[PDB]
């Protein structure tokens, strides 16, 4: 973990560097390339769907085949993925690059999350999981930030550049990620998180990607004014994801933490819908997302604890279902958004209350031994 973790985090940061990198450059490919808009729906769904199809498989052989190899193969498919996305003018290759892109995130993320769940010690494992989610978020921030930076630099460039780090992380994958030490089956124990992962990510991501739109019309934020609210939640999110390990030293379990994180987020979200002036939605917006930024490691730690082995597969189910939630969620909340502005919040409240219901059922289920 002296150098193994610092390159393992570099693999995961690199993928979300790639996912976020598409956003400021997607609406400039597909017009000068000549695309219609039904394919834009498929273009942004090919990544998610192919991530959904592969992750339960690409990560149930990773246990049997080997963690190191499937990550390294993941990067060489990651490196070639971003190369075809910026090579030349077609659509079937872009539609195939996105599918290959979903292959790379389908064999790395379940494999690497299993790997930093196998080398990390019995304690401080939640800290590494908290450290990872600090980084996947920092991938989501730096990605679109880098893509807007390489603007006058021939906008096919970010994929060459991210392709280059696909090579750089590839050599470091054989060298630095030397073979780990060495080495229930029923799916019934996996039931309660995957619906919990799906239900939240259905509603949580409904608010998240539409937060820049909900506060756009309600309190009328300037475009250089959301950025404070985005970063302020990120900083308190990042600070609390490193404060995250101390909570499990104090808290009795992870499920009890999920309930209180959800109940806390409900209370803040109720303040969020009532308050309609600038400064009492700003200061609230800093602490709206403490419940959400710090539940994603709690969910991820929940997968890695129940799965005594097959931690590639358990991380796979997280990766397939949150990608399902991040795909299904915004589409449904997009229709409900236009009847009245506050609709994604009730989805955020509703799945949060649904999240409280699900965790309470498990608590009395475990009370039944």
């Amino acid at each position, epitope marked *: 973990m002296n150098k193994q973790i610092f390159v393992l985090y570099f693999n995961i940061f690199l993928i979300f560097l790639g996912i976020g990198l598409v956003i400021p450059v997607l609406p400039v490919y597909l017009k000068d390339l000549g695309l219609t*808009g039904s394919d834009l*729906g498929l273009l942004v769904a090919a990544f998610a769907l192919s991530q959904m199809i592969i992750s339960p498989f690409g990560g149930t052989l990773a246990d049997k085949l080997g963690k190191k190899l499937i990550i390294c193969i993941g990067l060489i498919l990651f490196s070639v993925s971003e190369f075809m996305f910026a090579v030349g003018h077609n659509f079937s290759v872009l539609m195939l690059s996105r599918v290959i892109g979903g292959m790379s995130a389908g064999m790395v993320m379940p494999g690497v999350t299993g790997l930093i769940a196998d080398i990390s010690p019995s304690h401080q494992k939640a800290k590494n999981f908290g450290y990872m989610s600090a980084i996947i978020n920092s991938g989501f921030i730096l990605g679109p930030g880098i893509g807007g930076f390489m603007a006058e630099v021939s906008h096919r460039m970010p994929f060459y550049f991210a392709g280059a780090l696909g090579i750089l992380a590839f050599i470091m994958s054989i060298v630095l990620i030397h073979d780990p030490k060495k080495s229930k089956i029923n799916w019934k124990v996996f039931i309660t998180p995957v619906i919990l992962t799906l239900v939240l990510s259905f509603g949580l991501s409904a608010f998240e990607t539409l937060y820049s739109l909900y506060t*756009a019309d309600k309190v009328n934020y300037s475009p250089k004014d959301i950025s404070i609210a985005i970063t302020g939640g990120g900083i308190f999110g990042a600070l609390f994801q490193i404060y995250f390990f101390d909570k499990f030293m104090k808290y009795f379990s992870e499920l009890t933490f999920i309930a209180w994180s959800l109940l806390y987020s409900v209370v803040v979200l109720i303040l969020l819908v009532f308050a309609n002036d600038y400064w009492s939605i700003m200061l609230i917006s800093f602490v709206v997302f403490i419940g959400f930024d710090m539940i994603r490691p709690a969910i991820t730690n929940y997968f890695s604890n129940i799965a005594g082995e097959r931690q590639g597969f358990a991380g796979g189910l997280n990766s397939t279902f949150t990608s399902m939630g991040n795909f299904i969620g915004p589409l449904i909340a997009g229709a409900l958004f236009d009847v009245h502005i506050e609709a994604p919040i009730y989805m955020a409240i509703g799945v949060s209350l649904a999240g409280v219901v699900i965790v309470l059922i498990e608590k009395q289920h475990r009370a039944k031994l």
Partner: antibody
Amino acid sequence: EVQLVESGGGLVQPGGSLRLSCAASGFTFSSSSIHWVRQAPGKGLEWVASISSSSGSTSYADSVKGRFTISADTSKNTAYLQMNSLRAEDTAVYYCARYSRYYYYAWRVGGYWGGLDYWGQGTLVTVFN
Amino acid sequence: SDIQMTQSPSSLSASVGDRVTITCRASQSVSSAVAWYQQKPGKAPKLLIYSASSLYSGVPSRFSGSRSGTDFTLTISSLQPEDFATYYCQQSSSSLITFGQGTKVEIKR
């Protein structure tokens, strides 16, 4: 991928009730809503109605509110527009557009892309006769 | 030639390959980035730039949706003989939609 064609427009008396019809083949992977953009002869566009596909909720412009009555049927996937009590300032070419608002997760930096993607050919409505 | 969102100039003449900026001042609800439509002389209007995420404005090249102060601007880097039409802003709202009056971009000679 998706083709939507409109039909029903034609001549009418100043006060008669036309009924346009905009059939649509779909599933374009977005959140749909069939608007009814209006273009007068030699003028700019002017949105005049809107139906959401799920939980249908009409929404009319300022000067054509109440006088129109828009509705949709899931069986044939069509967005009627029951005009009522017309006037010489209602002759135009009534396109039927489509709102998509494609989404992409992006943790808080969410990628969302809207716009009226797909349009009909243009059905002409003439009111004074 | 519509109203409720003044956009300037009404009609401009720009030759082949030049760089031209067209802009529209929105209402006092400046958010939900304006989408831009193109309508050739006699067909159904097309759609150039989607409504972006209001963080992604001033995109790299050839067609820029530049979220300026309180007003939105479209800059055309180079004009082919394929891009001569009228351009319309589409500012959304809580439930309704307003279209700009429309600047027609016409060939020079």
